Design a binder for this molecule. Structure first.
Ligand SMILES: CC(=O)N[C@@H]1[C@@H](O[C@@H]2O[C@@H](C)[C@@H](O)[C@@H](O)[C@@H]2O)[C@H](O[C@@H]2O[C@H](CO)[C@H](O)[C@H](O)[C@H]2O[C@@H]2O[C@@H](C)[C@@H](O)[C@@H](O)[C@@H]2O)[C@@H](CO)O[C@H]1O
Ligand SMILES: CC(=O)N[C@@H]1[C@@H](O[C@@H]2O[C@@H](C)[C@@H](O)[C@@H](O)[C@@H]2O)[C@H](O[C@@H]2O[C@H](CO)[C@H](O)[C@H](O)[C@H]2O[C@@H]2O[C@@H](C)[C@@H](O)[C@@H](O)[C@@H]2O)[C@@H](CO)O[C@H]1O
Lengths: 288, 288
């Protein structure tokens, strides 16, 4: 097993098309998350809707159709091949920012302004597992539309956006949803990789694996040889070890954050390096 | 360390010049055509060239601070992480788009209602990214620190077309050097993505390395042990070799296309695999 030899600020978020700005631990360190993107086992098994490339993250493709009140999209995979409602929660790469309006910028797969902004609510017609969503738009999109999540806003007036939530993929879900990630306790806290992103009335989107970690694991198909992988976070200029982290086989990273601090207090240009396989209860030196 | 290429099928690789997925390979209609792309450029030893960034989510992005001039508005460019851009030995900030001789339309948000601004950028006199600024017009009112992504392109003037095979005039701008087809019947392999090119001959953008190849080389920091690396393009299900390719130290890929054909006739679900180091003069079996 190796992990990407790339500084953290050159790594992409796995839940929005953005670069990682910093690490942090959650304010409540017992908080459970269930992100559907950025999910991959160390052996290279993709989970949820997680795609391989950073340029598949939080994108939507589909064909415009007429609904009772206006338009909708009959979803396809991002490469234009048919989506089928099967085991995945949604087409691969489908956004997983829950409980908010989405604003998705698409183009028809030209003359004049080729872009349409699809304004999508997560209400009853939001059925991505089934393969359809509805939208309103100030433009007039038709046919095969491909696009990217541009920004998010509250579902109802005066409310707030919580990007730590995931969507409900619909009533047909019974489905390979990626499972919740539980803090393993004993002082350990899940490490979240944060990105600037336009969240209106939120300002940063968390994910649990940088996207290049996901493609690294998929590519490598490495055997898991211990209960956790001990990583060092290294200053790439001085080559000094800045802190210890554990990478778990189910595909998330923890640290023991110093009280009143944590990995948010580390420089954001360090490189993760695999050090050794360790047992499940290997005790980390606190960080930050 | 031993050179490898990503164990990822073609259709899961990102374009290195626009934020998009690769959907096919091809050769240029003039097989003697020389290109000088500034993104997607990296040596096999992991040396980035031109404006090439590491992550697919840095590709064709722009960041800067809005300022007002005597006659309009401009962007004082920074690197994508907000740190200062200095004119030194690069054409522009890392990741800056390299689609030449056309208008750009760049969707940005304020790193801080509708949060988006579309910056409409002409490649005329005030387009001076090497020196650290460009001018724009916008129907919105962007201020302060704006970060965004190239959304679409259109012709510079009314009668014109967009040729995405061209690069900008950035100004001595320290360009990555031209790539020549290297002889022996070989043609440069171009990796194509759908993208909203308005008034292009097609709505596709070529690049010379998939973005994940770039990050792979940067990570691996592998020694070059021969004049060219022979690759096989392999079907991942049957494991059959679908064609020979050469990967050159300067960071590009060639094949010998069959007359009237080429890699555009190959399936798009194959995986490149390193075979061996070969002589510069190694004669490839024709493909497609
Ligand atoms: C002052 C007021 O009530 N203005 C509303 C808009 O609501 C304001 O801006 C929204 C983006 C939120 O920040 C909201 O908290 C704020 O009051 C309203 O925008 C819509 O707001 C709803 C939530 O109530 C959704 O977020 C919806 O997606 C928003 O519509 C988007 O943003 C709008 C500003 C427009 O750009 C739309 O085209 C977008 O789809 C608008 C529209 O209902 O009405 C104002 O009066
Ligand atoms: C029918 C007509 O003349 N319309 C023009 C617009 O030009 C049309 O749409 C363009 C995108 C091209 O497809 C063109 O071939 C087509 O006739 C014109 O758009 C501008 O076109 C110039 C080139 O002549 C530049 O490409 C410029 O960037 C375009 O402006 C952008 O696209 C516009 C549609 C608007 O969205 C602008 O805000 C963009 O900046 C417009 C603007 O001059 O005028 C119409 O009458």
């Amino acid at each position: 097993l190796t992990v990407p030899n790339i500084p953290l600020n050159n790594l992409a978020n796995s839940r929005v098309p953005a670069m990682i700005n910093k690490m942090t631990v959650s304010t409540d360190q017992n908080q459970v998350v269930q992100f559907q993107n950025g999910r991959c086992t160390l052996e290279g098994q993709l989970l949820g809707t997680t795609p391989v490339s950073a340029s598949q993250v939080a994108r939507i493709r589909g064909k415009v159709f007429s609904t009772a009140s206006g338009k909708g999209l009959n979803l396809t995979e991002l490469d234009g091949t048919p989506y089928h409602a099967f085991e995945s929660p949604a087409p691969l790469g489908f956004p997983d920012i829950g409980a908010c309006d989405w604003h998705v910028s698409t183009f028809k797969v030209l003359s004049g302004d080729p872009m349409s902004r699809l304004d999508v609510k997560q209400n009853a017609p939001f059925a991505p597992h089934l393969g359809s969503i509805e939208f309103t738009s100030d433009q007039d999109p038709t046919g095969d539309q491909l696009g990217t999540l541009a920004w998010v806003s509250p579902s109802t007036s005066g409310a707030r956006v919580d990007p730590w939530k995931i969507p409900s993929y619909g009533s047909t879900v019974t489905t390979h949803l990626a499972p919740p990630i539980f803090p393993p306790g004993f002082g350990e806290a899940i490490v979240y990789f944060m990105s600037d992103f336009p969240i209106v009335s939120g300002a940063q989107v968390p994910c649990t694996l940088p996207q290049e970690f996901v493609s690294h694991f998929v590519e490598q198909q490495a055997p898991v040889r211990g209960e956790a992988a001990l990583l060092h976070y290294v200053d790439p200029d001085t080559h000094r070890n800045l802190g210890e982290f554990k990478l778990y086989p189910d595909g998330f990273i923890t640290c023991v954050p110093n009280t009143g601090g944590g990995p948010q207090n580390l420089p954001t240009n360090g490189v993760f390096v695999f050090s050794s396989w360790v047992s499940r209860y290997y005790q980390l030196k606190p960080v930050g």
